[PDB]
RNA sequence: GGGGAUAAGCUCCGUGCGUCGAGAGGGAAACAGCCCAGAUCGCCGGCUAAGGCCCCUAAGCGUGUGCUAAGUGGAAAAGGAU
RNA sequence: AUGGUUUGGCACCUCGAUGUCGGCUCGUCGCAUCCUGGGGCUGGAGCAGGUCCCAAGGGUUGGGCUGUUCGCCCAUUAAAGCGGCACGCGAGCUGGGUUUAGAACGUCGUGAGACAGUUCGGUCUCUAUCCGCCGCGCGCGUCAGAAGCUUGAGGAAACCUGUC
RNA sequence: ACAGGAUAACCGCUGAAAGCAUCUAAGCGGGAAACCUCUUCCAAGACCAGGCUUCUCACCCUCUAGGAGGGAUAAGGCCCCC
């Protein structure tokens with residue numbers, strides 16, 4: 001559970017512009 | 024071709040920074056700049072040219088906020104369950120020079136050269152240092168205005 | 170303070186109390202000890218006294234070692250050890266050249282005797298760390314004594330430094346605590362320490378007043 | 384604030400010495416020392432009183448004002464009048480007798496308990512089941528009076544133990 | 560001392576305060592005394 | 597939008613939508629599919645994009661006015677709260 | 679809403695092989711605490727409890743039945759904790775179970791045969807290269823070459839407890 | 843083990859913001875097998891490679907005389923031997 005939430009969170013980074021592959 | 028330091032081109036000088044009442048982060052970045060020789064215009068990444076930096080009054084150094092009791096300095100011995108931590112307040116009481124050293128050590132390059140730079144940093148807890156024969160030049164932390 | 174004197178283990182024996190109870194004592198020769206040097210705070214950084222013990226032919230002693238004895242003004246001794254005290258108020262009790270004897274102790278005073286254990290050589294895990302074994306029947310294939318599993322698998326995937334396995338054992342310094350001294354023999358300079366002190370018959374030991382009961 | 388906006392009256396027999404943010408008061412009962420916070424400036428009116436002032440109106444100055452003023456009045460009152468805390472003990476076979484500067488309590492324990500008086504505090508026993516503790520520092524007087532109060536666990540059923548005179552302790556009934 | 564995510568002034572004498580960043584409720588009746596945690 | 601529990605890095609569809617597939621270089625610490633941008637070769641020249649400018653780490657412990665006391669920043673819900 | 683240990687959903691790594699249940703030996707970690715330690719509130723008189731908060735240093739038994747995990751039972755005990763580590767651990771051990779070929783019963787099938795039905799029997803291979811770990815040496819360094827005796831930054835071990 | 847230090851839960855003292863009240867914002871205290879010392883052991887390859895002492899503390903050759911190379915030694919050590 002811990003691993004999944006962290007990956008979806010790091011899509012919010014400034015350089016990703018709110019989208020990332022594999023969500 | 025751009026100029027690169029030869030055999031005997033490098034030169035050293037000794038700086039002493041009064042760590043009293045200086046912020047730990049601010050003092051460390053100033054020392055880490057000196058030790059790497061960033062101030063000289065003869066800088067070259069693969070050749071060290073930093074100037075020996077002596078830090079005196081290393082136990083009076085001021086740490087802001089609640090970091091005196093809530094910031095831990097961790098260390099692991101390798102054995103299972105071997106992780107032992109000391110809050111900064113305790114680490115200052117036992118041996119105070121460590122807090123200044125680590126906060127500088129983690130500012131320098133981590134490669135083999137950064138291990139050689141460390142040999143040029145002498146830090147003392149008291150207000151006196153034995154290196155008076157080398158005539159350290161007193162150094163202060165200002166900021167060039169733009 | 171922490172009285173101490175360098176001694177030699179002689180052997181074990183058996184003596185009887187006034188209440189007719191039997192006590193198994195170890196005979197320790199606490200031979201005369203010569204104070205060769207005193208370590209002070211301003212000189213060395215700790216407060217300790219350096220004793221010497223044993224008789225050695227002066228031809229045998231090596232020249233660097235011989236000079237240390239001559240400078241202190243004493244005859245060379247086989248073993249030189251050092252007792253660590255804890256203050257300058259205790260160092261003042263000692264002076265170079267003063268001789269210590271078995272009389273410093275009294276009957277009924279708890280002491281801690283330190284020595285090098287007996288040698289046991291390459292010892293298996295059934296002997297070293299007191300493992301169990303595996304059954305000698307019901308099918309055990311050639312595993313009657315070997316340890317067994319070492320760790321997990323693939324997590325951690327290493328052996329976790331600190332695990333207990335085979336290797337050399339014994340022959341290491343060890344200290345026994347709160348050993349009563351049954352009798353202080355005056356003529357022969359021998360302590361009758363009730364209990365079993367570590368070492369091998371004729372091995373050097375250090376007997377000091379107990380930390381806990383002292 | 385309202386507390387901080389009230390000048391501190393100094394009776395004629397009391398001496399007040401001010402050194403910036405450091406304050407010391409000398410009087411008949413003894414000498415006390417105090418230090419005030421950075422935001423507040425402490426000065427002396429020529430009438431012979433104490434006045435405290437706060438420069439701005441944020442939390443720090445407003446909160447520190449009331450404290451800093453009422454800290455001095457306790458300081459001045461300690462060196463003219465002093466503080467005496469009166470206690471009394473309830474229970475059967477509960478005794479108090481004074482030994483030197485120390486105080487002993489017989490609270491029903493298998494052993495008797497002894498309390499040592501620190502510097503600046505004195506114990507004066509009046510009756511076996513009633514005594515008093517007197518000193519200069521209001522905090523130190525109240526502090527030791529707290530420790531004495533913790534000697535016996537609260538007893539809602541019979542009320543055995545130490546008490547303050549005006550204290551009213553809740554009591555329930557142990558029936559079944 | 561009840562420890563709940565929700566603390567309320569059960570009775571009229573109950574007072575809601577804050578000590579060391581944690582909300583409490585202090586009342587003369589010890590039953591009402593609770594703390595947010 | 598359907599199926600699912602309006603779950604899945606699920607599955608099935610539409611899109612003169614994109615990229616990877618078949619794509620190097622800069623950014624996201626590392627990280628095919630996200631953001632900037634399509635590599636003809638050389639240069640010890642210059643200006644920029646996304647992203648940054650205390651030290652590692654290149655360039656700001658930048659200027660003005662405020663806010664935060666929680667290391668919030670540097671994970672989260674019903675709800676509680678002078 | 680947390681957790682990811684249960685029954686599942688998906689089919690993304692491995693079918694030119696990732697050995698699968700129990701037991702043994704060996705551990706190590708979390709705290710959502712069984713005992714021991716500290717507290718609040720009690721419809722807490724005392725003894726004994728109930729509930730909640732802090733706390734992971736140590737400890738946590740021997741047997742009957744079953745392949746059993748689990749469970750019931752017999753004696754104690756201060757307690758007989760819950761879970762992760764490929765439902766830890768088979769290049770460490772057993773093979774009782776399951777899941778090859780033999781055989782029989784019940785049931786299905788006209789028949790070869792079949793049964794997450796039952797019963798008896800049924801090969802557990804390998805000289806450790808590298809990381810790892812337990813031990814022991816050879817070389818060099820510490821600004822001349824050697825010998826004693828040491829401070830110790832940094833680690834490791836231990837920490838249980840009852841009755842009178 | 844005994845003892846000491848800083849603490850968790852919890853109990854407090856002095857106290858304003860907020861004429862009262864509040865363990866809290868400034869201060870001061872108590873407080874557990876947990877943490878740091880205390881007990882035992884390893885430990886200067888701790889590259890900041892440590893300290894107190896003691897002994898030897900001096901002889902030749904070569905290239906070219908700058909440094910290096912070669913030999914014989916002292917204190918000491920090792921090998922062979924019991």
Ligand SMILES: CC[C@H]1OC(=O)[C@H](C)[C@@H](O[C@H]2C[C@@](C)(OC)[C@@H](O)[C@H](C)O2)[C@H](C)[C@@H](O[C@@H]2O[C@H](C)C[C@H](N(C)C)[C@H]2O)[C@](C)(O)C[C@@H](C)C(=O)[C@H](C)[C@@H](O)[C@]1(C)O
Pocket residue numbers: 695697801802803
């Ligand atoms: C005596 C000498 C034999 O040792 C055995 O009997 C071991 C004990 C078998 O285990 C027997 C015994 C047993 C119980 O397994 C231990 C049983 O499971 C099966 C029948 O294998 C082996 C290793 C089998 O492997 C196993 O094959 C399985 C299909 C997969 C399994 N694992 C990788 C997935 C793997 O170990 C396999 C295929 O025969 C290996 C092949 C190459 C051989 O024929 C080799 C040359 C054999 O002559 C032999 C090794 O010399």
